[PDB]
Write an enzyme that holds these catalytic residues in place. Structure first.
Site, PDB file in Angstrom:
ATOM      1  CG  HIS A   1       6.590   3.507   2.627  1.00  0.00           C
ATOM      2  ND1 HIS A   1       5.255   3.192   2.387  1.00  0.00           N
ATOM      3  CD2 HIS A   1       6.929   4.539   1.840  1.00  0.00           C
ATOM      4  CE1 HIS A   1       4.823   4.021   1.460  1.00  0.00           C
ATOM      5  NE2 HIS A   1       5.818   4.829   1.081  1.00  0.00           N
TER       6      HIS A   1
ATOM      7  CE  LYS B   1      -0.297   7.816   1.996  1.00  0.00           C
ATOM      8  NZ  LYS B   1       0.917   7.003   1.863  1.00  0.00           N
TER       9      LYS B   1
ATOM     10  CG  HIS C   1       7.815   4.841  -5.794  1.00  0.00           C
ATOM     11  ND1 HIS C   1       6.569   4.973  -5.200  1.00  0.00           N
ATOM     12  CD2 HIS C   1       7.718   3.887  -6.758  1.00  0.00           C
ATOM     13  CE1 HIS C   1       5.741   4.153  -5.843  1.00  0.00           C
ATOM     14  NE2 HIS C   1       6.393   3.512  -6.802  1.00  0.00           N
ATOM     15  CG  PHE C   2       6.192   0.998  -0.677  1.00  0.00           C
ATOM     16  CD1 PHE C   2       4.800   1.022  -0.715  1.00  0.00           C
ATOM     17  CD2 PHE C   2       6.825  -0.181  -0.281  1.00  0.00           C
ATOM     18  CE1 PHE C   2       4.043  -0.107  -0.389  1.00  0.00           C
ATOM     19  CE2 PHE C   2       6.087  -1.321   0.051  1.00  0.00           C
ATOM     20  CZ  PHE C   2       4.693  -1.279  -0.010  1.00  0.00           C
ATOM     21  CG  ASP C   3       5.237   0.336  -7.922  1.00  0.00           C
ATOM     22  OD1 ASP C   3       4.328  -0.421  -8.193  1.00  0.00           O
ATOM     23  OD2 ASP C   3       5.505   1.439  -8.604  1.00  0.00           O
TER      24      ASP C   3
END
EC number: 4.6.1.18
Length: 124
Positions: free
Chosen positions: A12, A41, A119-121
């Site tokens: 990210h 992805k 963690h990128f929600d």
């Protein structure tokens, strides 16, 4: 912290440009961060804000993750984001991306130690 903070930064982060206006960005980037590796992805978001700026979010608006919850923090304001969106059909080395640029807010989870986003929600 040893693989998570790296994992997040891998996927990210892009604090070298203030933005990204072209599908070139996405295509190079996914490749660069070897995000097409083995299996590219479908969609990925790059934050164009200094890493510190992003870590800062870990102590901003406390929210609920799209799972467990808090330990989820929301960016006060607006972040320069780039959205990478798959495009090219077939299930192989054939991965092309479109570069969509937004200005949204981020929801991140943080493993402090000091604080590091892992963690990128959701991206809003």
């Amino acid at each position: 912290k040893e693989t998570a903070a790296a994992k997040f930064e891998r996927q990210h982060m892009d604090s070298s440009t203030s933005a990204a206006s072209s599908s070139n960005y996405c295509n190079q980037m996914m490749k660069s961060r070897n995000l097409t590796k083995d299996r590219c992805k479908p969609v990925n978001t790059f934050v164009h804000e200094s890493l510190a700026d992003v870590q800062a979010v870990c102590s901003q608006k406390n929210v609920a993750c799209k799972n467990g919850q808090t330990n989820c923090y929301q960016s006060y304001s607006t972040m320069s984001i780039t959205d990478c969106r798959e495009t090219g059909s077939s299930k192989y080395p054939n991965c092309a991306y479109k570069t969509t640029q937004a200005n949204k807010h981020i929801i991140v989870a943080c493993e402090g130690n000091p604080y590091v986003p892992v963690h990128f929600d959701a991206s809003v």
